[model samples]
Target: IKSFLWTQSLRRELSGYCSNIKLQVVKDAQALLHGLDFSEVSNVQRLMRKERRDDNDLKRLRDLNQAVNNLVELKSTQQKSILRVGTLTSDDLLILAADLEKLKSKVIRTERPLSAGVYMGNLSSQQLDQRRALLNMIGMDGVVRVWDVKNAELLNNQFGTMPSLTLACLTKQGQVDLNDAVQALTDLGLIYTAKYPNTSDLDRLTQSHPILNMIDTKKSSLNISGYNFSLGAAVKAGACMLDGGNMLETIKVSPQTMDGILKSILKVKKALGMFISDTPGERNPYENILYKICLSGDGWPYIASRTSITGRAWENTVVDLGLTYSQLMTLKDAMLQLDPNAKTWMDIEGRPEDPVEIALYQPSSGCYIHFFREPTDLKQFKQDAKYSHGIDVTDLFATQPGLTSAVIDALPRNMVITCQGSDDIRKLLESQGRKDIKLIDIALSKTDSRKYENAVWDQYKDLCHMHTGVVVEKKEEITPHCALMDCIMFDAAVSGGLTSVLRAVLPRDMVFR
Candidate 1:
């Protein structure tokens, strides 16, 4: 099934490379699987197994005496869908645990009354674990209480929402403790004042906290082998070097194991430069992003989720830690180097050979100045996280305007963005004021990728061959949006005289009298 489906996906078999197959996509692929559709599993290995039921807990679970009695009533109906389900008690928790067993592989039984069910809190009490799982599965320690389970961003399910930075005055629940969300807002200057916090204040904050960056990810998360993984083991699993096991490996499930795992992850947290939350949760968004990159490669859904937080493609953990992408590959190679399962990680198939680096260009000072040359009257260009400042090349314009176009380097390349437009402006300006131009700034206006992604801007590139919000100068001829009289006066003021063609185009200059 794996080989056949993988090939069909490659051949553009299911309508030109669909991503991450689903039930419907599989059905579609089966149609295209025309020749090689026969795949089978042995019936002997897939025998119907009866579930073990203990009557005492079942008896205890059948009827709850106190507070959870209402829960039992709702749960006993087996309203398995989390959407409709209410507060669940032991029996429902058991059913849900049983359901996981039903859904996952039969290769190795991950049966442990005390398993770290991914985002689930590992077991303490049989009843406590049950209640905890229900509460957590439904509503985690989140910013908002998800009521109808309808239009809700379930934070726990989304590991990105896990406890990351201690974030100076926020609760574990992510609510801002007014006592000091005020402190830092005023401190970091997150306060609101109309007409105030104008561009410089905005620029100041952007400069102030430069390093706190969010990283990107792809479709992540898989059921772990459940046999308590050490730091290396977890890394191997994340790198896709191992198949999924249980208590039999330790082969004991103990606080020591969980504690040891905690320490192992802590080591990972410190090894990679991610923030460690003082509280309990999935370590950090950075940590999760690393795992996502390692496991799923650059799948779009994961990128979407990661970008949802960072507002663009997220940075890699390698770059996040100030190391290059090559460093991250070496880090993975080192991780793969030491494993109990032979030099097995080296032979791993699915891990990424190189990080996907997004090409980012900060439109240069000349780019900005050239942007101003456009007759569009556009002064400022805005970006969410990018910043641009003024460059000092106007000495030539002020000191010697005639020699500004003296061709020190070469003649114009037309609308090239890589070079300064001082010469071009000098040509027009030996004929326009320094103040008419704002030096530079790529500020936050709070404005609001892939093969086809390239097809987008490549066709519609700016005058500079880069994407910028500012209008491009399509032609050297002045074409102002204002009235012809105002434009002619401005042109006459700068250049000293109007051409006969210009005069011909605007015969009204003669007729207006």
Candidate 2:
């Protein structure tokens, strides 16, 4: 009947259960079965003869008891996930059935109940042990608490036989002689913090404290493992393949396991911002936890979360991919030639309060260009080059005058400007203190009108031929969305100026835009 009741209470295989509650529920079932009557001994004996749950049952029970004890000592740690992903395959049910008979013979053990607080008068040694355990769990020793003088004096007198024995009044109530009690402890050399140490005093205390030293040694021995998904790994790798580092392994994880992995990483250092997205357009619980840990006002400044570049969707039609190592090095060279400290430039959006900005990268031409926007104000140029390139710099130079001025402000001495324009444009370039810049004019034709046409036909071909690289193409690009910009940018950044590497790994005919 108990087995039937347990089975009925939790339908759908035990494999679907979450990790934290799995062992607890199994223990509950074992405890329930332990009380059941098995007068039909032969039938049970026959079942046991067929399959024995001795080893599995013993290990699970032992693990559960250990986990419970660990839970009691969990006052110091705050940022951690207590759950893991459960086994969700058919094997779980077979193991579940085998453990039923073994559970019936298992007996549940009970512990003595105890309360936390100061005990008055005299207490037995066993009672003192229980009191200390409860108090430790409550973190009572760290804070100053109300105390009865009579009780304190009695405890101090009783523990006189053992010089190492210490006693303190940790009653949660506020109406106590705190100053007098602290002074008494100070004179007795029982409490170091009795005088309320200053910042430097605490620093010195931490440096020499044996307990703190033990903690540091323990932490140094830990081997921390971290897992990474696609986008986050790409950022760390700073290259094509998403293997960020040896520590960040690539794998798929359950939502709870994902949370567990991040929390584990947090114990070592600031985990880089997590990247996750929901499919079928639903809110993801795991992603929400990542945001909760990363967003502003949470005190986790090194943590951050972004749904999409735009906000509504994962990808956007206009993709601003991150820079490759070669491109980054080139950019650093350009910035260093001007000013060593000015290695990168981030063009701020309107109002300093705006969180979003247009991030521009200076191209090989040593000329600044906005990768975030259309890069041009010429309607004909934009229309003419829409299909050939994701960004149009030549059209931008011909149209936006303020952009021209901004570029001039940071332009290097040896700037190469590629555009299809007459001598008038060259005069305009020379007018802006542009004696150091050289302009290459393109003929006004369909071939030259394509955006990034120089990169696609000239630079791209040269790099591939020079390096013996192959050009692999795919049929489609991702659709426009905010959350998916990382994927788009990852593709573009790896591809450099050409779409071949970007499209090579993409699904056939994949056009998310």
Candidate 3:
């Protein structure tokens, strides 16, 4: 029966074995046999069968088992050959190796262009053919002397035999390419750096001016429509005076000259939309106040630069100024008690939530100022101050009627105040007495009619836009195209080896992102 069980397929005879067993026992055994393949079992049994025909059947079964074992060993050896480091198959390794080689060759090809000289000067057809031949012979790493024969005949006194001898100048060192040769010549003042030279006295005067020197004259005239908005267009105009046609000599620039260059770069930054405005003529009132407070030091005990009247910006101001969160709450309550309707605040941008406002907060000093219209306000302010302290603050403050009162209430114990003069302000001070309120006398050179009259913001929306001369887009509406353009310029700068950190004071976080 055991031999029969092994030789015959169990599917048809499964009931025969279960006949003698109890029905319950048979059902339990049937469950264990679930999914068992009787055909496979019969096939294996047929191979293992030792027929009665001869005793040699046993020997044949042993040989078959040996063959099966050999097949398993062969599969194992094949798997080991295919396996590589990690999960990569042998074929995958071959492909990756080829890709790496191609990438290496591509890198070599890309670097070849940067090493080659780019000739920007006009050349005759004969000279062009000669130039190409010379370049091919010299490659990018060959050095050759340059000769000039302007007045060779006049050198009769200097040279006895060769009356007018051509002079060969060795300006470049070993292994100099064509581009390097031109760059060296420009740096040494042998050639004009700019392609379009100043034609007239006015053009020369403008070109000589530090800030004006960077402006691209032709492109600026052709592209920019209005003088105001076209600031960016002029900035996008190719080449900068300071860049010196990729031949700016860094060692030659003095500290003062470097300062002017940075100031100009900041203007470029403004034109690139990195700042709110390119004009740095006047200081905004918010910034003016914040600067006074920061410079005053411990005398101005607690201060905040608030963006929103709802006290949203106050929290930001508090964190920035290194003042306590507890102080923020205290000041808010104080301001509310002074005037319940003055729960929020109006910044230089007119309102706290204005889309156009660029709220600049100096966290270390607790100086917060919202630059309305353009970030150029702050950039200009910083640049002008770097240049001088007496630029102007003429158009900065408009009538911020209730703003002074809110600020006064928010002020801590003995503190000095400097602000635009008014009758309501003097009355407010008289009520507080001399000791509690100290006033730094500010003589106004001139006064204007602009005043903060209506509390409702919508009524003054057009006036606010008119004041800043800027129409700010909604945050969601702005695109990253300008930022990307700036990135492209930065990439160019880096590629040409101009990777100095120009603004040393700029925070690390502000550099990349």
Winning model by lDDT: 2
Clashes of 1: 5
Candidate 2 Cα errors over 4 Å, as ranges: 1-199, 211-404, 414-428, 431-433, 436-513
What residue runs in model 3 are displaced by over 4 Å at the alpha carbon?
A: 1-366, 369-406, 420-424, 428-435, 447-513
Question: Which candidate, 1 or 3, has the higher TM-score?
Answer: 1
Tens digits of per-residue lDDT, candidate 1, 255-293, equal: 222222322323333444333122222223333322333
Question: Scored by Cα lDDT, where does model 2 land?
Answer: 0.25
Question: Model 3, 1-513: lDDT tens per residue?
Answer: 222222122112221211111122223223223333334323433533322212243333333323322322111010001113334334434433332223222222222121112232344566457545533432221212111122212211110100000000011112233233223222322222322233342244443333333223433221111111122222211111123233211111222232232233233323332221111122122222222222211211011111111211111122100222322332232221111111111212211121222221211211222222222355554333233221223343332222233333554344434333333234545553434754443333321211112211223222122232221234222211111122222223223321111111111111111
* TM-score per model over all chains: 0.16, 0.23, 0.15
Record all residue pairs in model 1 with backbone atoms less than 3 Å apart, i.e. clashing.
216-314, 218-302, 429-432, 431-494, 431-495
Candidate 1 vs candidate 2: the lDDT winner is 2
Query: lDDT per model, in order?
Result: 0.21, 0.25, 0.24
Clashes of each: 5, 18, 14
TM-score of 1: 0.16
